[PDB]
Amino acid sequence: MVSKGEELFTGVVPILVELDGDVNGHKFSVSGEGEGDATYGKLTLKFICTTGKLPVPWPTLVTTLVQCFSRYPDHMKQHDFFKSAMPEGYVQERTIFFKDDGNYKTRAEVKFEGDTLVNRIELKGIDFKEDGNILGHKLEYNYNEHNVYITADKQKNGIKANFKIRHNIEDGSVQLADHYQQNTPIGDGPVLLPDNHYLDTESALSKDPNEKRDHMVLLEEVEAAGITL
């Protein structure tokens, strides 16, 4: 295998996610747990709002709540920055602009803590409309397929990504969320700096029928693409 970190993902890897958020002063925390199987680009996660009621729609947090679990085809193995940063991990930073509404800024560390892949996130949201699609909870509980466009950032020894998320509104219209992303290794080791490609990212949201707490069950299937065999 072409990076040391890539070997850490040949099997099923337990995952922990911890998020602390503050959006227009509405504070919340989310904890998630599950497992990833990057061989197949798959993961399964269950998230709980540990502070009670989530003040923003669950779909708006999907992208923030581990692209190291992507399946890179055999011919694209030299382009997997995410696994190559492991186990020291990477900082993942975004700004996410909700069209005609506010923005989230996120900073996350994704790294191994023992045998667990851990995503620890801080999120700050500002300039939201209290009666908008976000703070007004007007988004459908579903998720569209999206491509995440990745380019190398030689300078920061890292990558950049941008993409637009389409969140379905309750009336069948769409709330757009423009994502800008930077990832930089935490560790000192060499990392793989990719040619241009994308992650074909499929997400399915559901509820655990036995769960009383405000929650989201998420299954994802992601494969890298865009470089011809």
- Using Cβ positions, the residue closest to Gd ion within the complex turns out to be 200
* In the complex, least distance from residue 93 CB atom to Gd ion, rounded to whole angstroms: 26
> CB of 71: closest distance to Gd ion in angstroms?
9
Q: Give the amino acid at 1.
A: M
Number of residues that bind Gd ion (CB under 5 A): 1
For Gd ion, the closer CB: 186 or 225: 225
Of the pair 80, 200, the CB lying nearest Gd ion is at: 200
The least distance separating Gd ion from the CB of residue 203, rounded to whole angstroms, comes to 11
Give buried/exposed letters for 115-135 (b at 16+ CB in 10 A, else e). eebbbbbebebeebeeebbbb
Shortest reach from residue 202's CB to Gd ion, in Å: 5
Binding mask 153-192 for Gd ion (x = CB under 5 A): ----------------------------------------
Cα–Cα separations (whole angstroms), residue 108 to 7, 11, 79, 87? 23, 24, 21, 15
Is 220 a binding residue for Gd ion by CB under 5 A? The answer is no
Residues 6+ apart with CB under 8 A from 149: 161, 162, 163, 196, 198
Q: Would you give the distance in Å from CA 195 to the centre of its chain? A: 21
C-alpha span between 181 and 153 (Å, rounded): 11
Q: Pick the piece of the chain touching Gd ion (CB under 5 A) from 24-32, 45-53, 71-79, 199-207.
A: 199-207
Residue 110 or 224: the one with the smaller Cβ distance to Gd ion is 224
CB 216 within 8 A of CB 66: no
Instruction: Choose the stretch contacting Gd ion; rule: CB under 5 A; options: 58-66, 151-159, 168-176, 197-205.
Output: 197-205
Residue 31: CB partners within 8 Å, gap ≥ 6?
A: 16, 17, 18, 19, 47, 48, 50
Output the smallest distance, CB 222 to Gd ion, in A.
7
**Binding to Gd ion by residue 200, rule CB under 5 A?**
yes
Smallest distance, Å, CB 147 to Gd ion?
8
Binding interface with Gd ion (CB under 5 A): 200
